[PDB]
Amino acid sequence: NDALNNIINNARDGCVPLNIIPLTTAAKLMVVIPDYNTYKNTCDGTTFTYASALWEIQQVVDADSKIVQLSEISMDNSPNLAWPLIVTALRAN
């Protein structure tokens, strides 16, 4: 990606620590979630910023890889779900 080549030109020397490359330059985001609470506190709505950039939800699969719409996740449809849902969001821009 250009964005990398950017970020490396911007280097002081051509050396950047690794832990900020997949964070800033990478695209498709995966997220794990254990609970409904953490869900509604951290990936609630249809989008969100995080690491200071926007992200869009695509699909929310679960433990058995069953597609689950962003609707069923009520507070109270929760105790009927395999719980560590995987949210596959995207580098929103």
Partner 1 sequence: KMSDVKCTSVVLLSVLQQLRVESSSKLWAQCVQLHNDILLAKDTTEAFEKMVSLLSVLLSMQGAVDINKLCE
Partner 2 sequence: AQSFLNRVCGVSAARLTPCGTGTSTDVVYRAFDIYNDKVAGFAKFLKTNCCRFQEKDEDDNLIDSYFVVKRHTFSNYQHEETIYNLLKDCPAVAKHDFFKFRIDGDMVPHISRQRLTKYTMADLVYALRHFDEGNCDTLKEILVTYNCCDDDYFNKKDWYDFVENPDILRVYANLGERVRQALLKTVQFCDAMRNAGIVGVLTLDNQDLNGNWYDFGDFIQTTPGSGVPVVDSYYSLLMPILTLTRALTAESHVDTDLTKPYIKWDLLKYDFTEERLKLFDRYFKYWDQTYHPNCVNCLDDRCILHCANFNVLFSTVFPPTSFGPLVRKIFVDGVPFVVSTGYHFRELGVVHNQDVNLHSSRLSFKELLVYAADPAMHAASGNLLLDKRTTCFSVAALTNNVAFQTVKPGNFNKDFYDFAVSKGFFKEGSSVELKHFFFAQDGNAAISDYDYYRYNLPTMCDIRQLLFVVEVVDKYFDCYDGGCINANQVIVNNLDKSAGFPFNKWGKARLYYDSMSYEDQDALFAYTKRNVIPTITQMNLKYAISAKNRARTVAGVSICSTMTNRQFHQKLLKSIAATRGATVVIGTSKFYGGWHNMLKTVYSDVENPHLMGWDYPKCDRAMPNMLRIMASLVLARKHTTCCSLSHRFYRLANECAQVLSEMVMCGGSLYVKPGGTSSGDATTAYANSVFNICQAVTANVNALLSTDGNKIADKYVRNLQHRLYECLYRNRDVDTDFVNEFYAYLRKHFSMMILSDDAVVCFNSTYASQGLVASIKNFKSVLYYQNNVFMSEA
Q: Tell me the C-alpha distance between 29 and 74, whole Å.
A: 23
Shortest separation between residue 72's beta carbon and partner 2, angstroms: 19
Which residue number, 19 or 71, has a Cβ lying nearer to partner 2? Answer: 19
Cβ atoms of 70 and 85 within 8 Å: the answer is no
Span 51-90, contacts to partner 2 by CB under 8 A: 61, 63, 65, 84, 86, 88
First to last CA, the chain: 15
Tell me: does residue 82 bind partner 1 (CB under 8 A).
yes
Tell me: does residue 63 bind partner 1 (CB under 8 A).
yes
